[model samples]
Target: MTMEQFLTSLDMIRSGCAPKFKLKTEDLDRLRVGDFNFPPSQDLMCYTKCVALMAGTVNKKGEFNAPKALAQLPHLVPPEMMEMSRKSVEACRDTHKQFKESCERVYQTAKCFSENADGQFMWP
Candidate 1:
């Protein structure tokens, strides 16, 4: 599957339509299923990249602390980037328990997917 196909599949899934996307072991285990029009291997690779992106984005800034201060932790972030990070941090603080809830949700999603996969049909 090409990148365009993968993106389109993602779009469909985002649009609330379940598109047929290949699933990998990690995806199946993590329950991070999606309609990506990519081969299982490529799809899995993209999935890893995507989760990292989500980990960086999603919740308000500074929600995880790691992404917000990614540069400061080891290097240095530019002023503009630092300012953006600060905003994210503030947003995170405003959304009480946002990080905790996200963790819980991810855990539950993984567990559910694993259970379903283990007990059900062979994925593809």
Candidate 2:
């Protein structure tokens, strides 16, 4: 995964912006490879959680078809998790807070894991 691509995608995500290129599993995989140490397992775990949060945001905004769009996410999260996300989004209660907190938790954990493994992100 190219750092440029991962950072670009992250930038878009952070800015609530969508890039011209699609953000699919492939892109997520690439970001994992570029930024993380372990294999795709941890990445998948973190990604699933983060996407859940994003799905919540999208659902709250009424911008995304939560069920359908969430089905398109990388990992196979359980139905209950997806349903919780949908409900949270629909409630529009603390959507941004949930997203940010999830992101921070996942990112910090991922970062520490990488650092402990002496895995540095390859920037380009």
Best by lDDT: 2
Q: Where is model 1 more than 4 Å wrong at Cα? A: 1-63, 66-77, 94-124
lDDT score, candidate 1: 0.35
How well is each residue in 1-124 modelled by candidate 2, as lDDT tens digits?
A: 3434444655445334223223455545554454644454533544534543453423322233335544543232333334533443244322334334443444443333334333333211
lDDT of 1 at 7: 37
**Candidate 2 residue 89 C-alpha distance from true site, Å:** 31
Candidate 1 — which pairs collide?
61-88, 61-89
**Candidate 2, which segments miss by more than 4 Å at Cα?**
1-22, 34-100, 119-124
The estimated TM-scores of all candidates read 0.24, 0.24
List, residue by residue over 18-51, the lDDT tens digit for candidate 1. 1233544454443334332333454443333344
